[PDB]
UniProtKB/Swiss-Prot annotation:
Broadest EC class assigned to this enzyme: transferase
Origin species: Homo sapiens
Keyword Iron: no
Gene name of the record: CDK2
Subunit text: Found in a complex with CABLES1, CCNA1 and CCNE1. Interacts with CABLES1. Interacts with UHRF2. Part of a complex consisting of UHRF2, CDK2 and CCNE1. Interacts with the Speedy/Ringo proteins SPDYA and SPDYC. Interaction with SPDYA promotes kinase activation via a conformation change that alleviates obstruction of the substrate-binding cleft by the T-loop. Found in a complex with both SPDYA and CDKN1B/KIP1. Binds to RB1 and CDK7.
UniProt lineage: Eukaryota, Metazoa, Chordata, Craniata, Vertebrata
Entry cofactors: Mg(2+)
Annotated function: Serine/threonine-protein kinase involved in the control of the cell cycle; essential for meiosis, but dispensable for mitosis. Phosphorylates CABLES1, CTNNB1, CDK2AP2, ERCC6, NBN, USP37, p53/TP53, NPM1, CDK7, RB1, BRCA2, MYC, NPAT, EZH2. Triggers duplication of centrosomes and DNA.
Name of the featured protein: Cyclin-dependent kinase 2
Length: 278
């Protein structure tokens, strides 16, 4: 760690503290995560090889004393701050579309490598001046945000799949479009019920096996489903159709990242550059 000079703290929570730092030798500016303390070290060192333009690079893993440091490629801004900055006008559709497309590319890559993110949220999606967007904080190692949690996770499924990331991304897509969180729950049951209130209480018809999930209770209220026209106005039918497929209750029916990339919504995708104030 002596090889790094901390510039300023930029994060704190899930694991440890995050600092913007300079590599005293390479001259590089990086994001340095210091986690307070065998399989882990091995697995993590592995994922280090995983390289894709839409995944934040893990540059170094440094273990010393009862401390573990992860060194990442540095990006100045995240999507949550950009969404907040764009709140008055909203992010232009062509940029929402580019970001969604890129995130699906990153996920398709992770997923083809049997890697699940598990906790996608705007705070952990980093953007740059070139119009790129990247997946960060995979939880490789505060109030927990539940807004983007897939229903199978909330219902106690222990062996959930890559479909959980597609659900999270659908929630983020909707939020970019409407400028409002889709399902802002403040507890696990409130998150669950907010989902049910919008998409309808799931049953065996639309989600075979749902009534047998660990945390499923027959006593859940039975709400009827709303229509997406009310959910994400004024997103076009191509966008709504794709969102509906990313928000299917049944994980096995939920669209994959690879198939989503082929959806008609992306026929006219481009790569616009955002206006960022760093
Ligand atoms: C907004 O704040 C953040 O996003 C913070 C700080 C930050 C802030 C700015 C930055 O530029 C970087 C980090 N991010 C993190 O703490 C953080 C944590 C992990 C992790 O799982 O431990 C992680 C893993 C990969 C990775 C890489 C390759 C393969 C795989 Cl499976 C995973 C890539 C980025 C990651 N970032």
């Amino acid at each position: 760690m002596e090889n790094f000079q901390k510039v300023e703290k930029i994060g704190e929570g899930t694991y440890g503290v995050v600092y913007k730092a300079r590599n005293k030798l390479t001259g590089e500016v990086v994001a340095l995560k210091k986690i307070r303390l065998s399989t882990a070290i091995r697995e993590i060192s592995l994922l280090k090889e995983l390289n894709h333009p839409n995944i934040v690079k893990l540059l170094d893993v440094i273990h010393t004393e009862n401390k573990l440091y992860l060194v990442f490629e540095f990006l100045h801004q995240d999507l949550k701050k950009f969404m907040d900055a764009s709140a008055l006008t909203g992010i232009p559709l062509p940029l929402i579309k580019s970001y969604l497309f890129q995130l699906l590319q990153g996920l398709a890559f992770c997923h083809s490598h049997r890697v699940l993110h598990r906790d996608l949220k705007p705070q952990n999606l980093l953007i740059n001046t070139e119009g790129a967007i990247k997946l960060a904080d995979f939880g490789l190692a505060e109030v927990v945000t539940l807004w983007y949690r897939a229903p199978e996770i909330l219902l106690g499924c222990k062996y959930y799949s890559t479909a959980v990331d597609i659900w999270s991304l659908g929630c983020i897509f909707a939020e970019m479009v409407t400028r409002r969180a889709l399902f802002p729950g403040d507890s696990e049951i409130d998150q669950l019920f907010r989902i049910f209130r919008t998409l309808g209480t799931p049953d065996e018809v639309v989600w075979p096996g749902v009534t047998s999930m660990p945390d499923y209770k027959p006593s859940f209220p039975k709400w009827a489903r709303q229509d997406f026209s009310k959910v994400v106005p004024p997103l076009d039918e191509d966008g709504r159709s794709l969102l509906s497929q990313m928000l299917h209750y049944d994980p096995n029916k939920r669209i994959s990242a690879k198939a989503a990339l082929a959806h008609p919504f992306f026929q006219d995708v481009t790569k616009p550059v955002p206006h960022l104030r760093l």
